């Protein structure tokens, strides 16, 4: 009786939300950006190839100086690279080799990683002893760690395969806030530039917008047909892009609370692993299972270019904070640095 | 740029120290053979191989056969959904699949799990070392006659023991029909697709069986040997 009535009320609320979004869908982003000129052909060359990982690379993250980057591989190795010289700054042997994510702290003093061990491990890069040591192991997730991002030297947000995201106090080792509401494995998260909000994409084909301080879900974004594997905030924080297993990338707007544009091609039938924006947000770079990275025009949904330099799955990519270069990691155990030329 | 030159030499020196360590790790990594252990709760996968270390939720077993190191990984502390974390093991030497043969109710469940692993895009080149565990209980169940396989598998009514079958001495003919029908049920899946890139190695094993480590060693040799033979157009 009560249960049957409640699930009927959910359908009424879902229709109410759908009508509200349709009411404000006066125009389409495609129609708005039809007049603007295209970006042309985007040609990027492999400036650097980072060799030394002996297994599939699963994650990478640039440091805020746009020169150092950290990559994680399932050979049990965290490597910090000097991208300008290709020198290896550090090589951190992991206690558990099944790492799935890595994060570089904005201060540059810490890196984080974690995988099937259900632990987010924090490593101190600046010690008087001259070596990298484990400073914290964040336990509490009951599933694999899929993504982690530092807010500062003391706070980090993690997404897990136990359908929850958590905000951690690194000094105390306890999760201050738990973000629940996903019905599938949360695969990725992206922080807003002001670090007051973050979006997460899960395997329930939905993206949720979370308030960091309040700790509740503000908005829910649907429209994908399969698991979301990647998510990235637009540079101004008012939008985000997702990548799913349905071979599509979608651009959602926070304030309009709905999808604005879909980035898919008929030839593309493979899943999407990673998404990122250029510094101005005009370019959306996406990694695919077919070993390639497609550069999209974010405003016009045009495939601007292709990064074809890997012999296995493109597992991750990222654009520097200054926008100078993009790094791509792959299951073929290599990282490549790309940028254009005048 | 005297100060800059000093930093470049220090960074170059630091890189060389890392590479020397990475060379040592390369020999250890390539010498070890990694295995994924899969099975339901009813199957006794934890007692298949007679060094066991619990690293977080993942249970690891390290055993050595003829100076060859095998690292078997058992994923314990995860939700029942596995389509995401199964991709972590796309490069293992083989997958150890353990099935409770006596349990007819969950037999189709194991077949469905085996089907997904065999046909997954990221596991298309991984052989499966199938262990049909608890064969002693299957013999007791068949001889008792309380439960019939035809109730769950109607094909078994018109199934006959293969000519190549090698029944154990002093084994009832009704037992070897049940043993090989279950094995053939898994072989129907493994021979449907694969294109010679991976093969399924089924074994009949009991709880008191100390030869399972050697069987994994033998099958792993066949898996890599067939990969080498196929590469040289010899297979």
């Amino acid at each position, epitope marked *: 009786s009560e249960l049957d009535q409640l699930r009927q009320e959910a359908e009424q609320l879902k229709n109410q939300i759908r009508d509200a979004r349709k009411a404000c869908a006066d125009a389409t982003l495609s129609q708005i950006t039809n007049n603007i000129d295209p970006v042309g052909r985007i040609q990027m060359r492999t400036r650097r190839t980072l060799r030394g990982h002996l297994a599939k690379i699963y994650a990478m993250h640039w440091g805020t100086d746009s020169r150092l980057l950290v990559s994680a591989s399932q050979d049990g190795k965290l490597i910090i690279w000097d991208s300008y010289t290709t020198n290896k700054v550090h090589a951190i042997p992991l206690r558990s080799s099944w790492v799935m994510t890595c994060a570089y702290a904005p201060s540059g003093n810490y890196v984080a990683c974690g995988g099937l061990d259900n632990i987010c491990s924090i490593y101190n890069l600046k010690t008087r002893e001259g070596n990298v040591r484990v400073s914290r192991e964040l336990a509490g997730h009951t599933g694999y760690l899929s993504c982690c991002r530092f807010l500062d030297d003391n706070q980090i947000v993690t997404s897990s395969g136990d359908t929850t995201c958590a905000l951690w106090d690194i000094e105390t080792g306890q999760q201050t806030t738990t973000f629940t509401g996903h019905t599938g494995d949360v695969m990725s998260l992206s922080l807003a530039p002001d670090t007051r909000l973050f979006v997460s994409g899960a395997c329930d084909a939905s993206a949720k917008l979370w308030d960091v301080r309040e700790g509740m879900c503000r908005q829910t974004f649907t429209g994908h047909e399969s698991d979301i594997n990647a998510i990235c905030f637009f540079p101004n924080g008012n939008a985000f892009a997702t990548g799913s*297993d349905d071979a599509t990338c979608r651009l959602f707007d926070l304030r309009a609370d709905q999808e604005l544009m879909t980035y898919s091609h008929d030839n593309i039938i493979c899943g999407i692993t990673s998404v990122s924006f250029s510094k101005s947000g005009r370019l959306l770079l996406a990694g695919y299972d077919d070993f390639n990275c497609n550069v999209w025009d974010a405003l016009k949904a045009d495939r601007a270019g292709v990064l074809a330099g890997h012999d296995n799955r493109v597992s991750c990519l990222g654009v520097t904070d200054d926008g100078m270069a993009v790094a791509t990691g792959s299951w073929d155990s290599f990282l490549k640095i790309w940028n254009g030329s005048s | 740029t005297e100060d800059q030159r000093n930093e470049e030499k220090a960074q170059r020196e630091a890189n060389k120290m890392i590479e020397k360590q990475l060379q040592k790790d390369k020999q250890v990594y390539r010498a070890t053979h990694r295995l994924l252990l899969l099975g339901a709760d009813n199957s006794g996968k934890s007692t298949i191989v007679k060094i066991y270390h619990v690293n977080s939720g993942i249970f690891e077993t390290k055993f050595q056969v003829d100076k060859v190191n095998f690292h078997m990984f058992d994923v314990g502390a995860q939700r029942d959904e*596995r*389509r995401k974390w199964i991709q972590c093991f796309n490069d293992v030497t083989a997958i150890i699949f353990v099935v409770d043969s006596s349990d007819y109710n969950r037999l189709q469940e194991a077949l469905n799990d085996f089907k997904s692993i*065999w046909n*997954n895009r990221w596991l298309r080149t991984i052989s499966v070392i199938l262990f049909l565990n608890k064969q002693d209980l299957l013999a007791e169940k068949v001889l008792a006659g309380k439960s019939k396989i035809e*109730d*769950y*598998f109607p094909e078994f009514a018109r199934y006959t023991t293969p000519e190549d079958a090698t029944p154990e001495p002093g084994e009832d003919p009704r037992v070897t029909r049940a043993k090989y029908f279950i094995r053939d049920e898994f072989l129907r899946i493994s021979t449907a*697709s694969g294109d010679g890139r991976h093969y399924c190695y089924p074994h009949f094993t009991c709880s008191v069986d100390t030869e399972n480590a050697r069987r994994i060693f033998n099958d792993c040799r066949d898996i890599i040997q067939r990969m080498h033979l196929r590469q040289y157009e010899l297979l």
Partner: nanobody
Amino acid sequence: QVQLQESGGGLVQPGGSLRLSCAASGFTFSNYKMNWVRQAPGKGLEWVSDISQSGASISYTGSVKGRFTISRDNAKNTLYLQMNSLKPEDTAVYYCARCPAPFTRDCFDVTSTTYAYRGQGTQVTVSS
């Protein structure tokens, strides 16, 4: 939003016939393999039958083989399950489960406790 609505079912005498319908929305129905999953009272979910993307490949569980027929209509975006000669052991909640990814032969987690691409289910009762 991906949503599946199971319709049909109810109280049927043993030996009767029953047809189940699954209405698909929020995804390209022709790109996914579809499954039928049931959960008997006091028991966990079990897989019943599946049908490939084009309907060429069809499978069943041995307990319902010869009595259940599964068909799909890609144009109608609908999935069907014809259940004739029913048995009291078939009393269960029937679920319409979609395989998680398109253009795949594997189908991993349809018979899982909390699966996102599985419908609310329809109740089928055979006990007299």
